[PDB]
């Protein structure tokens, strides 16, 4: 699960459960942030069209 979330084979010598929850929160935040950017971009596009 940690490998799936961090992508980076950075052989972190010590994986913690708290670290796992943090990386999971980051993915959710990244998706939310990307959706917000897309929404902004959609507004920008709509303004240009208007």
């Amino acid at each position: 699960l940690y490998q799936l979330l961090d992508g980076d084979n950075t052989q972190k010598l010590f994986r913690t459960y708290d670290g796992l929850e943090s990386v999971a929160q980051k993915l959710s935040q990244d998706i939310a942030s990307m959706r917000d950017q897309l929404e902004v971009s959609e507004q920008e596009h709509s303004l240009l069209l208007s």
Binding site: L5, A24, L38, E44
Partner: protein, 51 residues
């Protein structure tokens, strides 16, 4: 009362996976989320180029 219940409860809530779902679904779900992230990035890039 399982020792790791509190930690995984937190992980389920972070990835927005419902608590009633089977534990075998957690990795598949996270993989799909990553897939979605890639798709959203591609859409943003396409839209930014179009604008």
């Amino acid at each position: 009362h399982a020792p790791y219940y509190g930690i995984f409860k937190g992980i389920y809530e972070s990835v927005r996976l419902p608590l009633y779902k089977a534990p075998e679904s957690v990795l598949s779900h996270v993989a799909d989320m990553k897939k979605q992230l890639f798709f959203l990035r591609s859409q943003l890039s396409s839209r930014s180029e179009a604008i």
